[model samples]
Target: MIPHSWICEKHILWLKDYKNSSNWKLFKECWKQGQPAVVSGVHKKMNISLWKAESISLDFGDHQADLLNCKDSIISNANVKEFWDGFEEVSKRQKETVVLKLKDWPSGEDFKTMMPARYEDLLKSLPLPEYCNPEGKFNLASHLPGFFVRPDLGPRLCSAYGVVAAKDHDIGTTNLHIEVSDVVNILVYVGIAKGNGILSKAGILKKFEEEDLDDILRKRLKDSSEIPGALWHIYAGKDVDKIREFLQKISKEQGLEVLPEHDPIRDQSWYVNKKLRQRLLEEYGVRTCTLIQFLGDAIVLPAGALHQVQNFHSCIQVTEDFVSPEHLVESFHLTQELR
Candidate 1:
């Protein structure tokens, strides 16, 4: 099993708070309506023909004059000459320079094995500018099939687009905002907190060896309470005082009796005061509790819950974020096959 350290602690906190916040409710509603809202600062618009045909020539300085003319038409009428002059000097320098071409081309057999369709044919038929040479040597195999194979002629056509504005514009100033649907799925699945393996198999009463707490938790499983499960917990690595204050507020809000002292573990006294633990274990078999926290400024879906991250002094680093649909299906299929 992957440890919590594998994921960002800040992400865990954001996710926890997000699950219990009103924003999550709104996010769920939006998701159900089939409109996924992405929050980002950048926006872009593209001229398809220019992108496929012209951008290539500008980089290689092949057919530079033709590309410049095409670009002029797309840019605002006033900025045409200024953009053309800048591009001309850059193209001249590029043509004079000799750049090393790395020979890391994908083998035909390897391409065929990975992609569902003929990769070469797909690239040739791609909706690009008339000037773009279909037979041009390029690493088409590295491109994502979902983005490149889009039937729509709109923003969905390319993986990303360059940001533009009403005034001052230059290629250097442009930024691309790529969609991260795959990463989000990975975060969601990895963040889910499951019950302890031993307790799940042997039962909570057997695991904890507390008959009274087990019975009380069983009886109050379905009763309305601020806390939902048999295992009581605050946010992972949260301040002790903050946890108590939260519990006190919850008790006052829900009209449940609040004890002066805080008990970190489930005991006989806890069973007498809060019987929900027993009910949760007996009915749902949920002995492990979670305290999720979503990172600040991070966006998450509603109904996301029960994930937590421990806080520490060191900086948290996110190195990789990816998920495979094939892997998910294969795992599920294997489970069913075994069953």
Candidate 2:
């Protein structure tokens, strides 16, 4: 419950006062170094001021995902929440585990009609990366935001996805994963976390090594082989008791009331083993970085950064991606091998 933000204040990067020119270059170099840092105040440019968890309707069909079973279904929000009640119950009864996700998105006119007509305004309001905006030489893939951008931004839209998850929804440990391009994501929520709309914490892990990491990871990306120490499908968040135990001990020793954030029975699957954490930190030289993701906040992850999201409040968020200039060199060098 006592979620003391783990990242150091010195390593935290603030962008609320940034302009397009002076700030983006400085951060780009920081990102290129592959260090773990927290980015705050970037979401101010986003049009997320109006997002709410209850605004969604039933007909739009939420994508119900169970990662443990590698299965997906579509259902209404009420039904989706009810169905998960049983799933979470059975998970506790069996002293076992389970993971599930519910996703929804409407496109084109449906997107504007069902959600909010202003959804496009929201997407349009989002600022693009500042360093070296794409030129005439940009490729078709570069023009996508996971989907289309605003009509006026005809080219910047590499691809985009509109996602909504209702209360009580949780994403199982999504294991560290990499992506093709850099990403800018926006989030907001209400009726917050702890089996409901909880704030998300992001943990970034990288194999710290002297070997040509880019080469080894590139080959692994090319061949889809598992490395000796790195593994997937494991949780990234720390154990609930460990977090609260220390805080509670201090609180009781001082004869103080329990802190509000300490929830004893936090989400079941939200844990990373102490031994596994030790191995990652000591043997593999992997560093687990933290980002305190909250409402009206944006967290941008650089390409190929191994990261995972901790549980969060049911939210509706949008993300845009592109080949940043700093990443462009790597993309050119590494992508040339993509066949």
Candidate 3:
């Protein structure tokens, strides 16, 4: 497992200090684009505060809750390793048959050509039991369709459940076993928000698309309608130039001091942005997208807005939503240990 202590010691401390500084106000002001006192310095100010805040959050305990927050991290770290290992071994036998079509490959011919071959080999290697297969047959196209999308609603809603006739079948179990890890990935991705005041990943199929599946698949899959593809309609982060311009207008109106030179930490905005972009592409096959956020004490944006918890400081308390007390307890324990 990846060490949690490294995350907490390095990332969390930075957020705690940044939250206590005067810049926080400037950071928070950027989100209010339509407010009378908005200013241009808002985006930069927000990005700086967000980066520091996210760095601190990353340093927090990575337990079950962390796992829950970043579901992709746990699943990818745990299963993908074995999945790929087996795939590489299989490729040795079926070289020509496994090569991907040129159109399907994402980029270069050399590296892309080998991906499909590796994928087929990996599937054959996983330890799936006999009864686990529907009709006692394995169909990669029917079963393994990219990463499982686990909403905050819990595993009962997972499409994987449809594979089983009953919840307590002895031979096999259903539910988003992989989704257990996606939550953690989401949280860490959210943490990156501090750097750019935006967090986004593509290919996380939204609800409208999932709901269109046949009844059998729908029953097994979780609907993602609640999660929007774009964070905001008018001010989505996809257009960085527009966002910067908007922030400048807000800053001018608010009479905020605009820095002449780029701050080193603030300038590293590209790092956070690039990391999120790379993560989406490498992990989930997502290519085109962006995310944005404006941090504050208790600001709640639209339904699908991407934001992270910063400097919650015991002042923030949330009632349990869909998660159970037992699961929440497990999550707390997992986070406390810094795994």
Candidate 4:
């Protein structure tokens, strides 16, 4: 019998009211699971509840300026000043589903403008989780993937407050995906009072436990035992580039070579293969848990947890990412394999 513990609603930790051990223990155990966990009110001290799209306007000058059309792989670049004034109306008629990610908080300029009045003190003082020595000083999200990867690119990609604009009428919904490197994301839906994100339940974890991908790799790795060994150990320590160096360096030490990730899939090995969705259903099936994040409520995604965001009508929200000590090992492994 599956422990009721595995597929339990207790999986969703309600932290809206906390500072007490009862809630802290629940939050910690949920984080340890590496599965999707619903986290609410983890940022009670800050008045971030004031950020709502109805009242806030975004600037798109720094980066992520293009609108992605998933159906045909098309991109339409528009500056925020010109595009979003009434984007929700125009997007409804387009044949291709369009989605845009805008990150103007490059230097805390636009980040503060859209936030609640006089919000920096609360934001800077937020008590966050620790990752390494001393822990959670709040720089990991601010100077990451983009800041380190391409400084000239500006601070838009850092751990600044940002929003994703998506409309179901013309924009396609997100497919299942798992991020790589040090991108552990926490998202809070603004102006959303109802609904939950669809998450693959314990049954999904059970499928992976049953060697879902290993079964396929076994056939592919029959010739080189070393290859599979490398795959299982591929971990990204901080950035993707360095993670690759470490992966290849370590794998070569074992007389193995990591192959190219473009296996007729999403062109990246670490990302979930889109074609495997049905195979997953036919083989192991799935039971999903709905995570209804309310206004001011937050959902913290574990490193490498596969999930998709769902909301009623067009949606915009604030999101942040960090590298956590909890999943550092697996993050490093994916780093090398992805590299």
Candidate 5:
């Protein structure tokens, strides 16, 4: 893990402050070129404390949800309460093949309509940056100019509800995949299990400069001792073909045949672990923009970029998809390709 940190260091851009107008342009420039970037201290801009696991478990305890066991490659249906209770135990075991996460809640429904009374405060305090905000002019999702009835694609909450080791480093909570629309993933809460968890790992860190952050973010870090959640490996859109070729070669070597027209990335079977990461660099000279997604960090992913996620701790992330003018061409191409 230490050796691979350099890969992330070179590619991932860290935008220190979101309120700084220049950072917005920098982010847009990264997006325009289909690169990945993270804006730190965004949790301070929003009322993210309302999204804690305990609060959600108390409010929506019995709400049936999908749980994905990434280790076993199985999906099971359980209530939210079960997931919260089981998280600590799962993390304590430290078994690579036993990671579990609660999947999408309030599946396929408008958040404003489906959101419960407990989240009323959260709904009122939602703060989005100018570029990625669904209501902003840069987002095509906000202004459906020619449509009579605009489709509600998102402002949705997709969560990774699980507690896993910081050292496991085998696969991601969510496997490698691509999305048709550009997205902004905001991490609200990142939790670790109590007593001898992997948070102590030297390679995995809890990084937040107190003076550099606002009061809300600074307080949240000091009070809760919350660390960052997931590590991401995001590839540029231009390298999509090279990555696809690599995945195909791996599939063949593993005795799994991928049909000509079918994409291995779309299948979501690979995690791009350390060995494969090295292979990508050595064989095809493909590199990734890898980074730690700290709490309140907003990750902007461009359309059609192949990306994977590895959770460092238990986390709640809210994601919204937007069609941007810069990536409109790739969006259309992906839409046609998927069909």
Candidate 6:
């Protein structure tokens, strides 16, 4: 049986909280140890609401965004206006069948050059956390001496709206995966959808108009908010082998064939739900750092960690990927491994 002590809160490392700008040392310690942490109260210092979908649709409607259909795991380029319009249509459905996520807006491009008008405002309103600031001493990606040409690892905006339903299984907003570089993600907004499904018949939702639905569900996705938009489970890089073994074992038991060469986390198949989490802890002795990410919270994930995200509501977030001095070795090894 899995005991309560397996949870990060009771054992292992709970995320170190960095509530203000002066806690760079705390952030550095987490980074050095390759642990995840969160920085709160970030929204208060910036005009983060400007990054909301409605506002973005109004300003950059003509531009395009990469829309991922979470249900089918297909990504395609669509007009920004189309995404927002389709979002309205999908929200009307009761079962939340088509949960679309707009990831890496202005895809594969520099945020400053793409959104130059808003870029200045971003620079003025919000300062990158000292530890994540590329020009800072800790980030090796930028400060790597004169001999090296610095890599262009620009920031990107990630926004999506969706909720987990009773019947939804094996699908997460972002399935289990790992990034090659350390990342800092800031949640700017988190709002629950305005309605609920009365019933589902063969994947179709039956809608019923209920009074005070908005009154009961509507929550302002603002600063210091109690509402959490996403749930995160992050495993330290060293435990990837155990995670892979557990995944492969489970897959084999289900009569599914997983190639020995395949990396389960890279394949992006599992969300590690409660039952699987218990098995991983009790059977494999693998623990995870569980995080509830709320608005105004910036989560820092070390390079090469096994991580997954499940969004609980409609949300907007921005992420910056950087190579840190402490995790440069893992970053180098991951590069070789992925290649």
TM-score-wise, the better of 3 and 4 is 4
Candidate 5 per-residue lDDT, tens place, 115-212, comes to 65423533333333456665566777656553311244555555553423534566578788887777777787776554444444233344323112
Model 4, TM vs. native: 0.51
Q: lDDT per residue, candidate 2, 8-32, as tens digits?
A: 3233333443234344544655656
The residue-by-residue lDDT of candidate 4 on 140-179, one tens digit each, is 5343454232222111221111112222322222333445
Say which candidate scores most in lDDT: 5
- lDDT at 202, model 2: 17
How much is the lDDT of residue 274 in candidate 2?
A: 36
lDDT of each: 0.23, 0.36, 0.21, 0.35, 0.63, 0.62
How far is each candidate from the true structure, as Cα RMSD in Å?
Answer: 25.4, 16.3, 25.5, 13.3, 6.5, 7.5
The weakest ten consecutive residues by lDDT in model 3 span 155-164
| Residues 1-339 of candidate 3: C-alpha lDDT, one tens digit per residue | 111111111211011121222422432232233111111111222323322322323332131211110111122222222222222232221211121100111212322243344223212311111211122232121243223211231111000110011111111111111112112011101111111111122222221133223332232224332222112111222233333443344445568666765232222121223333354346444332222112211111211112222110101111001111213333333233322
How far does residue 154 in candidate 5 sit from its true spot (Å)?
Answer: 0.8
lDDT for 123 (candidate 5): 38
The collision pairs in model 6 are none
Looking at model 6, residue 261 earns an lDDT score of 89
Query: Which window of 10 residues has the lowest lDDT sum in candidate 1?
Result: 157-166
**What's the count of clashing pairs in each model shown?**
17, 21, 46, 15, 0, 0
- Candidate 6 per-residue lDDT, tens place, 1-339, comes to 111011254322223233344566545554677767665666766676677667777877777556787766777455456667654344444244556778777532567777775555544433334657655666676665532322436677777754444235345777777777777777877655543551222121111111112221222222223556676677878888889889888898889886768677778877787678889999899976666666777777777887887775667777777677777777766765664
Maximum-TM-score candidate: 5
* Per-prediction TM-score to the true structure, in the order listed: 0.16, 0.49, 0.17, 0.51, 0.80, 0.79
Q: What does the lDDT read for residue 160 in candidate 1? A: 10
For model 3 the local lDDT of residue 6 reads 12
